[PDB]
């Protein structure tokens, strides 16, 4: 028996032995995320520790077979993932210390409360306290308090823990044959071995910048338009040439500028296409929202939801009797078990969120035929690109009236289309310089380019330069504002949200193109198009088996990510944005600060 043949029978034994432990570990994690009990949180970690102990055991057993001997492309990829030494490449105490600081960062982030100096009896945490302020408040001082308090309280507690988090994670990456931790994360996009489709960890930094360089003109005009509107909501607070203060940006971190729509709406006299009143006034329930969702995917050529999904998914707030987590999630427990956890409210936002997470399930139901190690998105940004394509098609007013939530007499002016694209722009393009600048800083910090004496000093140099945002109050190195965001404090890579935004519009344009769509790209509903469905299905089933570049070609017909579909989606807004800045200044001076 050859080295390849032994590795194959090892993968055979592994798949059937991993399927049963992953289900037990995922069911235990479902028993906690739907039923917060101390019996289920210990049931969670015991099945989760057994799963990790099984992995680190099998990780070494995968190293029994040297990768250089394998010519089968599938078995080679699977053995590669299992041999990832990962956290096991650290010493016992350093690895144990690393696990401790990862939970505390998650803890002080999830349990950090800021207290009002005016009313010290009222102390709020991020959700719902601080986020509600940063999203709804219009008082400059009130938004300044909420923005700064979270960074001077939670972020300051995170500062020493993040310094140690970088050096310990760097010890893991270099011992795993990587340049830094940012190199480790960029390895998700790496394709090594396939002729003509290779893609290096350095290739990501090059391409994201080349596409970001071409993203600047649209964002520069959206910035100047939003800036002038914000000068009206905060007079004598914003310079018409300077950057936008970080606390007036819609949420705690400026990630999405959605909440500025009430301020930046082009034509506020128009009736919004928000059918939230229609959903509540028609006695719709959580069942109707998700059964209507399933109807969407089937009418495109995709399979139904399993009966296990129907009886076992949690689609409502579990009431006062059952305390649970309510983060909208789509569960793939394996062994043909697919579920969606969501404390659904009868609102338009949930009708689009139901289509997002159910898009994940259809992706999960498709690649379930792949082996256990290849049941995953082509890269980290593929799954969320699928979830948003449903949100895009389901948001069109033609789709709203085809379901019965929008009246047939809704007239689609060039104003209501500009209202919608501006609505989509504040949340989509506004987060791209944010996402890039964030990961760009993290990549440099892991690379050692930003010494600890100028972490926050360099952080805001890129904030004013790249995204166009200025701090409202001066921050020294005692703060750790990067770690004040969930993904940074919870060890989540962030470049996947930039790459998903580019993937999703390549998908949507090609799928609407296959659906013979003719009008504006934003006006496209994919329903009733069984042709475009099988087109997308050709990619969903591949999982992680095929290289992400190859899987991208089967739907879009391209080898690399492209920004032109994103540009073409926002083309009616970009020309109208050029007009609205005819007597306004595009661009920003990096030197203006809302202080002395």
């Amino acid at each position: 028996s050859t080295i390849e043949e032994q590795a194959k029978t090892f993968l055979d034994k592994f798949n059937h032995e991993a399927e049963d432990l992953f289900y037990q570990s995922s069911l235990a994690s479902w028993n906690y995320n739907t039923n917060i009990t101390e019996e289920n949180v210990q049931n969670m970690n015991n099945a989760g520790d057994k799963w990790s102990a099984f992995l680190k055991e099998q990780s070494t057993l995968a190293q029994m077979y040297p990768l250089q001997e394998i010519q089968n492309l599938t078995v080679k990829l699977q053995l590669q993932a299992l041999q990832q030494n990962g956290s096991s490449v650290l010493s016992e105490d350093k690895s144990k210390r690393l696990n401790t600081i990862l939970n505390t960062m998650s803890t002080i982030y999830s349990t950090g409360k800021v207290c009002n100096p005016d009313n010290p009896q009222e102390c709020l945490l991020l959700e719902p306290g601080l986020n509600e302020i940063m999203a709804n408040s219009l008082d400059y001082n009130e938004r300044l308090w909420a923005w700064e308090s979270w960074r001077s309280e939670v972020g300051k507690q995170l500062r020493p823990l993040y310094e140690e988090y970088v050096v310990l994670k760097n010890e893991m990456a270099r011992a795993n044959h990587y340049e830094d931790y940012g190199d480790y994360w960029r390895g998700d996009y790496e394709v090594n071995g396939v002729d003509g489709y290779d893609y290096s960890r350095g290739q990501l930094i090059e391409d994201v910048e080349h596409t970001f360089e071409e993203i600047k003109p649209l964002y520069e005009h959206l910035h100047a338009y939003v800036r002038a509107k914000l000068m009206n909501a905060y007079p004598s607070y914003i310079s018409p040439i300077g950057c936008l203060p970080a606390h007036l940006l819609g949420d705690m971190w400026g990630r999405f500028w959605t909440n500025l729509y009430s301020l930046t709406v082009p034509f506020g006299q128009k009736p919004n296409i928000d059918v939230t009143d229609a959903m509540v006034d028609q006695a719709w329930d959580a069942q109707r929202i998700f059964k209507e969702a399933e109807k969407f995917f089937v009418s495109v050529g995709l399979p139904n939801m399993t009966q296990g999904f129907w009886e076992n998914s949690m689609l409502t707030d579990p009431g006062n009797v059952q305390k649970a987590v309510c983060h909208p999630t789509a569960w793939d427990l394996g062994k043909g078990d697919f579920r969606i956890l969501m404390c659904t409210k009868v609102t338009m936002d949930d009708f689009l969120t139901a289509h997002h997470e159910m898009g994940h399930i259809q992706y999960d139901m498709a690649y379930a035929a792949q082996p256990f190690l290849l049941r995953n998105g082509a890269n980290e940004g593929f799954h969320e690109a699928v979830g948003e394509i449903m949100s895009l098609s389901a948001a069109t007013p033609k789709h709203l009236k085809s379901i019965g939530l929008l009246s047939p007499d809704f007239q689609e002016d060039n104003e209501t289309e500009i209202n919608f694209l501006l609505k989509q722009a504040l949340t989509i393009v506004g987060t791209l310089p944010f996402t890039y600048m964030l990961e760009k800083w993290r990549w440099m910090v892991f690379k050692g380019e930003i010494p600890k004496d100028q972490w926050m000093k360099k952080w805001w140099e890129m904030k004013r330069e790249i995204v166009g945002v200025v701090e409202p109050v001066p921050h020294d190195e005692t703060y750790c504002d990067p770690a004040s965001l969930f993904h940074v404090s919870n060890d989540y890579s962030f470049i996947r949200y930039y790459t998903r935004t580019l993937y999703q519009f390549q998908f949507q344009e090609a799928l609407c193109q296959a659906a013979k769509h003719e009008g504006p790209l934003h006006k496209c509903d994919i329903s009733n198009s069984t042709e475009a469905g099988q087109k997308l299905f050709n990619m969903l089933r591949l999982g992680k088996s095929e290289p992400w570049t190859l899987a991208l070609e089967n739907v879009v017909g391209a080898k690399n990510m492209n920004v032109r579909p994103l540009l073409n989606y926002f083309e009616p807004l970009f020309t109208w944005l050029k007009d609205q800045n005819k007597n306004s200044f595009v661009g920003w001076s990096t030197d203006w600060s809302p202080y002395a």
Binding site: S1, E5, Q6, T9, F10, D12, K13, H16, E17, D20, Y23, Q24, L27, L61, M64, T306, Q307, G308, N312, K335, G336, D337, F338
Partner: protein, 193 residues
């Protein structure tokens, strides 16, 4: 005297697919109005002869084989398959003349903690001949290593057990399967007036 078909179908416990069982039926009248007059089955696909004129037919003796397999692997109880079960657990001949029956048994063959009794063979050197049966528990040699009666690196215990949980999908759910093989011979049993 009636043929005891209910003794192979309505039986309490069923065997594992790797160690399946057979039951030979001889001289007795055969009432097949129990099977075709029943929407209870999840498969009911015949081979070699129709599903209705089997009432008026006679065979030397009929062989009823029964076992339990996951919902997905019922696909392999057909002539000429090459899955894990068809190759290492229960192989059918290309000249198979008979019917395959199957019905979901999640309520009685799947438990909360998982019914690990039902097993299947994953490793075996050489395929199975049609209607062959192997109860071997020998430590399978996957590499060039002697196993010395011990399992581990390049030596894998061949049997794997289904973990039948009642919340699995239709594919990973237990399905009791009974296969009715028909033996023809020039010798002088199972008719049905």
């Amino acid at each position: 005297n009636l043929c005891p078909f209910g003794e192979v179908f309505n039986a309490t416990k069923f065997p594992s697919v790797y160690a399946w069982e057979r039951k030979k039926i001889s001289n007795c009248v055969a009432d097949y109005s129990v099977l075709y007059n029943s929407t209870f089955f999840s498969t009911f696909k015949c081979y070699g002869v129709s599903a209705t004129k089997l009432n008026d037919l006679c065979f030397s003796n009929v062989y009823a084989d029964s076992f339990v397999v996951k919902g997905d692997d019922v696909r392999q109880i057909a002539p000429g398959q090459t899955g894990v079960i068809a190759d290492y657990n229960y192989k059918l001949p290309d000249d198979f003349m008979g019917c395959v029956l199957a019905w979901n048994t999640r309520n009685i063959d799947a438990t909360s903690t998982g019914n690990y009794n039902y097993k299947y063979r994953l490793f075996r050197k050489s395929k199975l001949k049609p209607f062959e049966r192997d109860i071997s528990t020998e430590i399978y040699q996957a590499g060039n290593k002697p196993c010395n009666g011990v399992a581990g690196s390049n030596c894998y215990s061949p049997l794997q057990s289904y973990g039948f949980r009642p919340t699995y999908g239709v594919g990973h759910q237990p399905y009791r399967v009974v296969v009715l093989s028909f033996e023809l011979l020039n010798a002088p049993t199972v008719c049905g007036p």
